[PDB]
Amino acid sequence: ARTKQTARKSTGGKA
Amino acid sequence: GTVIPNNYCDFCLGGSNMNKKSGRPEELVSCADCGRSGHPTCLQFTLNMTEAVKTYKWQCIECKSCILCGTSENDDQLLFCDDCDRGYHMYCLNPPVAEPPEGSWSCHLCWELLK
Ligand SMILES: [Zn+2]
Ligand SMILES: [Zn+2]
Ligand SMILES: [Zn+2]
Ligand SMILES: [Zn+2]
C-alpha cells in the first residue's frame, strides 16, 4: 500500500 | 480560485502533445488545488487509475488531503487508494488501521463502485 510518505519517496522525479 | 492547470508535466516537462519519457502524446492530469500537472505514465498510474483520477478533483501528492477529515496532516498515515488515488488517514478509517497493508489497498468508494 501507498501512503503520502511512501509515494513521495518512490516518485522522486516529480519537480 | 486563481488555479490554472499547468500545460507541462512536472516529471518530463512535456506537454500533452508529447510525453518526453515515452515519446508519445499523452494527456496531462492536473491537481485540482495547485495546478501541477503530470502525464499519468510519469505519475506511474495504471490505465484504470488514469481514468479514475479524471472523474473527480484529484490532488497531487503534496496537496492530497484526507477524504474523510479534510486535513493534510500525518503524511505517514495518509493512505492512497490503489484504484482511485484518493487519500484516507488510517486513523480516519473505521475500523482504523495500524499499518499500511502489503500490496494494494483500496478505499470504500471504490469497493462500493467496482464490486
Ligand atoms: Zn511526463
Ligand atoms: Zn497540488
Ligand atoms: Zn483524515
Ligand atoms: Zn478509491
UniProtKB/TrEMBL annotation, chain A:
Q: Which residues carry this modification: N6,N6-dimethyllysine?
A: K4, K9
User: Might you report a single GO cellular component term?
Assistant: nucleosome
Q: Example GO molecular function term?
A: structural constituent of chromatin
Where in this protein does the record say N6,N6,N6-trimethyllysine is found?
Answer: K4
Q: Could you tell me what this protein is called? A: Gene for histone H3 (germline gene)
Q: Which organism is it from?
A: Homo sapiens (Human)
Fragment boundaries within the full protein? 2 to 16 of 27
